[PDB]
Amino acid sequence: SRSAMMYIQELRSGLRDMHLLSCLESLRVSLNNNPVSWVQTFGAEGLASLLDILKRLHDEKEETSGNYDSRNQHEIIRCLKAFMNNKFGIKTMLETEEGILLLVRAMDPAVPNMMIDAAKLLSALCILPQPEDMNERVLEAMTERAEMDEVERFQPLLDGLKSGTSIALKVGCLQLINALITPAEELDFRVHIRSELMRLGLHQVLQELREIENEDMKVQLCVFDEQGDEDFFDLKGRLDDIRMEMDDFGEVFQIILNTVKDSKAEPHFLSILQHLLLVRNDYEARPQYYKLIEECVSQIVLHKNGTDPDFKCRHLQIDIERLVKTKVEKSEAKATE
Amino acid sequence: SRSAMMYIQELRSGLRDMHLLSCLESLRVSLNNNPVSWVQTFGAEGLASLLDILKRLHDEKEETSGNYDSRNQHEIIRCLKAFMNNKFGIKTMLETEEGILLLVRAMDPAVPNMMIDAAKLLSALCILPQPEDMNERVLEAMTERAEMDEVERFQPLLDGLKSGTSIALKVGCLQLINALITPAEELDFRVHIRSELMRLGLHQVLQELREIENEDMKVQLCVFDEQGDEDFFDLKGRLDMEMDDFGEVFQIILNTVKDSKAEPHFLSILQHLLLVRNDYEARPQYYKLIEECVSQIVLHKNGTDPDFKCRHLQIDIERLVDQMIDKTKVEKSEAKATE
Numbered sequence: 295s296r297s298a299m300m301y302i303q304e305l306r307s308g309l310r311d312m313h314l315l316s317c318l319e320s321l322r323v324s325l326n327n328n329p330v331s332w333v334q335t336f337g338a339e340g341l342a343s344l345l346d347i348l349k350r351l352h353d354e355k356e357e358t359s360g361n362y363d364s365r366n367q368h369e370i371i372r373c374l375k376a377f378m379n380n381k382f383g384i385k386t387m388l389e390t391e392e393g394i395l396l397l398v399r400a401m402d403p404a405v406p407n408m409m410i411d412a413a414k415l416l417s418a419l420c421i422l423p424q425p426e427d428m429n430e431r432v433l434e435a436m437t438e439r440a441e442m443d444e445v446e447r448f449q450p451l452l453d454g455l456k457s458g459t460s461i462a463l464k465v466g467c468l469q470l471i472n473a474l475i476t477p478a479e480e481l482d483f484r485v486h487i488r489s490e491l492m493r494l495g496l497h498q499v500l501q502e503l504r505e506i507e508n509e510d511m512k513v514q515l516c517v518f519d520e521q522g523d524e525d526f527f528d529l530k531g532r533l534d535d536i537r538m539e540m541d542d543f544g545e546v547f548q549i550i551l552n553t554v555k556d557s558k559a560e561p562h563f564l565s566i567l568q569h570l571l572l573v574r575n576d577y578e579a580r581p582q583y584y585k586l587i588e589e590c591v592s593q594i595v596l597h598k599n600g601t602d603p604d605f606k607c608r609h610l611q612i613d614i615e616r617l618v619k620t621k622v623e624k625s626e627a628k629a630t631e
Numbered sequence: 632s633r634s635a636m637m638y639i640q641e642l643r644s645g646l647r648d649m650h651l652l653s654c655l656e657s658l659r660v661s662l663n664n665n666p667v668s669w670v671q672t673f674g675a676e677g678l679a680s681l682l683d684i685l686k687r688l689h690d691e692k693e694e695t696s697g698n699y700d701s702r703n704q705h706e707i708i709r710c711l712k713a714f715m716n717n718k719f720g721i722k723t724m725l726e727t728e729e730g731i732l733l734l735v736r737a738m739d740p741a742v743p744n745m746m747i748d749a750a751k752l753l754s755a756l757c758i759l760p761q762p763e764d765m766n767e768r769v770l771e772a773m774t775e776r777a778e779m780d781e782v783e784r785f786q787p788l789l790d791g792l793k794s795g796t797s798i799a800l801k802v803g804c805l806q807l808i809n810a811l812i813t814p815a816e817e818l819d820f821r822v823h824i825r826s827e828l829m830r831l832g833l834h835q836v837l838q839e840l841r842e843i844e845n846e847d848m849k850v851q852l853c854v855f856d857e858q859g860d861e862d863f864f865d866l867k868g869r870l871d872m873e874m875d876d877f878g879e880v881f882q883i884i885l886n887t888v889k890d891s892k893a894e895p896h897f898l899s900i901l902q903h904l905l906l907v908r909n910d911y912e913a914r915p916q917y918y919k920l921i922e923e924c925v926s927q928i929v930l931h932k933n934g935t936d937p938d939f940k941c942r943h944l945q946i947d948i949e950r951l952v953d954q955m956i957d958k959t960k961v962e963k964s965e966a967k968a969t970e
């Protein structure tokens with residue numbers, strides 16, 4: 295069998311095009327078929343060589359790129375996959391300066407098969423329990439990439455979910471979305487990330503995705519929904535805590551003003567109060583009005599499915615069946631007595 | 632004379648610069664000098680083709696704009712004014728999809744003299760008794776403009792009140808403020824608009840206007856104060872007093888709801904505000920949305936939502952509240968029949 299050292303030497307000898315690919319293809323077969331023993335002789339040195347090559351193809355502007363650049367990037371990613379299917383391999387991948395960012399950069403929707411593979415590896419990394427905030431390390435890399443390209447960090451994932459893509463790509467994009475959100479301890483993080491996806495157009499995408507006759511998509515959708523529901527209930531529990539602690543009118547008001555102080559929220563708070571003063575000064579109507587307002591504020595702030603209200607939307611759906619013929623006239627008719 | 636059809640054809644070639652301007656200039660003279668039978672010949676079709684050019688011009692990116700764009704926009708506003716100087720023309724303007732909006736977009740503080748002409752036409756629209764919601768159609772147009780240009784809807788009006796502007800502009804902006812508020816039937820609505828002006832800083836702006844030795848400005852200020860005064864007294868009649876103090880406003884709500892069935896709901900509303908996501912960018916938006924829902928609820932009158940910006944709920948609010956009242960009186964008399 296071919297030695298890890300032979301491969302390292304070849305990788306550093308400036309292979310191009312079909313020759314590069316030949317080498318990467320052979321290495322990939324070696325990586326998948328050899329014992330972990332052999333992967334270790336490949337090691338950090340071997341990994342570093344793959345990542346340099348991937349870097350310098352990733353960096354290559356459209357006008358000077360080779361015809362086999364995609365193929366070669368993708369073949370490197372298949373090598374990373376093989377390198378990482380064992381404990382030594384993931385560990386050393388995590389220990390790199392740039393491995394995760396280069397995996398993020400491989401998430402190119404114009405090369406969807408490479409994007410499927412890079413997303414599957416980023417998901418596996420998010421779900422690792424050690425080190426501790428792996429999902430945040432993956433998100434950090436996504437953010438770095440967005441900063442360097444001046445793009446929204448979740449845009450490639452959203453592009454992967456467009457109607458024209460393969461089902462495998464849709465499923466892998468939603469899988470990575472689940473892997474970023476679900477392992478997060480903090481409710482605030484999850485709602486933040488979820489609301490960020492929604493502002494990018496996730497909701498309409500989801501509507502489309504719900505029509506797909508595919509079991510794996512149904513599973514990822516379900517996992518996405520479960521987590522939204524769990525977050526709704528965790529937030530609903532936070533509201534009960536508040537309703538129990540904060541029962542002094544002056545103190546609640548003081549805390550709101552502290553929160554809202556010198557922010558763009560302050561003029562909106564005043565306006566809320568100013569409009570309350572304009573509630574129908576009518577003994578039987580005024581309680582109903584305040585109830586209706588409470589119903590509304592309730593459904594805004596405790597928004598269903600654990601996401602912010604869509605602030606760009608014209609209309610806001612409020613469940614009103616919980617608040618509400620000539621049955622009033624005939625019941626008062628029991629004035630018979 | 633030049634016929635209405637000739638103008639409509641000219642307006643539909645691709646006239647540019649001084650050529651467009653001289654077409655527009657003779658058109659204006661035709662509109663001011665010919666019989667009203669002539670304006671009817673120009674009609675909705677001549678109107679639409681004017682509004683089309685205006686649209687393209689409003690739209691134009693600075694670096695592809697002609698040297699005479701603003702001159703041509705302004706001359707169309709002069710033609711709009713002439714077209715509207717009669718019952719047929721004003722009526723057909725009201726009927727357009729975008730005339731009012733295009734008028735509002737002409738209110739550009741960088742071209743003050745066009746802004747004056749446009750604001751004057753919008754004030755005349757607001758003051759029409761028929762249709763009955765003309766101030767709401769103008770406010771709607773102001774909200775749509777604010778969304779495009781990404782600004783506060785009353786900012787261009789406060790811009791025209793700035794010290795560096797001409798007196799004609801200041802007077803025109805205040806007249807239009809007056810025309811939005813004064814024809815409004817509902818105290819709620821006048822207070823809503825005036826309150827918004829105030830949060831945008833109108834008060835400090837007004838104090839400076841009070842210093843100008845100009846009769847027209849003094850008129851617009853007195854009209855503003857007299858309506859404000861009346862509103863204050865109508866509202867004091869309802870409550871028994873200041874609008875922009877947080878603590879004072881809060882206390883008055885408290886007193887208003889204290890020991891009634893509204894009081895539990897008011898506390899819970901405040902408590903729900905504490906749940907608003909602790910995020911720099913999302914929090915103002917949560918407050919904004921809540922505010923615009925509260926405004927709609929309070930402003931709603933027999934199927935009408937007077938403010939376009941406060942139409943998030945697709946609910947017949949008063950009908951709903953009537954149903955809610957209905958439910959409380961069935962429980963009360965049913966409770967009373969059982970016993």
Ligand SMILES: [Cl-]
Nearest residue numbers: 364365368405
């Ligand atoms: Cl490929």
